[PDB]
Amino acid sequence: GSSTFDALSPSPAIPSNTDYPGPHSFDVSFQQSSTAKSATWTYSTELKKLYCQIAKTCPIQIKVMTPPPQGAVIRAMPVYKKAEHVTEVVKRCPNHELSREFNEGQIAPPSHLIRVEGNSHAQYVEDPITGRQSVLVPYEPPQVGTEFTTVLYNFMCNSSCVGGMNRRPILIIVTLETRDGQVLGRRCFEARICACPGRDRKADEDSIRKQQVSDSTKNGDAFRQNTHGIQMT
């Protein structure tokens, strides 16, 4: 066919990051830790965003009110943030793709930007039409002693290597789906790979504190309550 897609029709599919708890209240969250140095990954709740370093483990937790159906699988796919880029597939760099896959005895070949750790049944699929890559795994019951489930993700490229992330921030969408292809719940988060995930998390927080000024509690109340004078030059 000469049309070779990318022309009039069919139009490329555009995934949406719209949250939808659904019946089982499917939610996503990332455990919090002190601002330690060389942190593999750190998350800020105020901004709903995660910073990670390449090849480091980022455990993520799913929270639901009642365990999903048996046979259900969890999906995770990377896509660009703005629509102008979400129609373009995210791929590997020329330098980092050239490296040998070393797939012998490995569950996650480098060919996929996102990989799973700690599940021998992790497998990857390719979108037949729009190229997108994604990885899937069977949902297991919540860990013993708590009500949530843990999945370990790994990234094989970093934001600033040309030909993959190419300085373009992206979003990751994680969904709970039934064996018959029906969606139960969808949640999404924003991801960045950087040299110091600890440093970027602190920086955005400092930007908010500067904008917000707190009133000292030395006095129970102001007698004059006058707003005279300049607040910010």
| Contact pick of 157, 170, 184, 191 for Zn ion (by CB under 5 A) | 157
State which residue, 54 or 73, has the beta carbon closest to Zn ion: 54
- Separation CA 148–CA 142 (nearest Å): 5
- Binding residues for Zn ion, rule CB under 5 A, total 5
Is 58 annotated to bind a ligand? Reply is no
Q: Is 161 in the site for Zn ion (CB under 5 A)?
A: yes
- Separation CA 78–CA 168 (nearest Å): 12
The SS3 call for residue 231 is coil
The pair of structure tokens assigned to 104 is: 């012998």
State which residue, 139 or 155, has the beta carbon closest to Zn ion: 155
Q: Is 91 in the site for Zn ion (CB under 5 A)?
A: no
Q: Is 107 in the site for Zn ion (CB under 5 A)?
A: no
Cα radius of gyration rounded to whole Å, the chain: 22
Is 93 annotated to bind a ligand? Reply is yes
Q: Is 79 in the site for Zn ion (CB under 5 A)?
A: no
State which residue, 119 or 166, has the beta carbon closest to Zn ion: 166
- Separation CA 68–CA 142 (nearest Å): 10
Residue (of 107, 187, 198) closest to 148 by Cα position: 187
Interface with Zn ion in residues 164-183 (CB under 5 A): 164
State which residue, 55 or 183, has the beta carbon closest to Zn ion: 55
Is 194 annotated to bind a ligand? Reply is no
The SS3 call for residue 94 is helix
- Separation CA 42–CA 36 (nearest Å): 9
Q: Which residues are annotated as a binding site for Zn(2+)?
A: 93, 96, 157, 161
**Binding interface with Zn ion (CB under 5 A):** 93, 96, 157, 161, 164
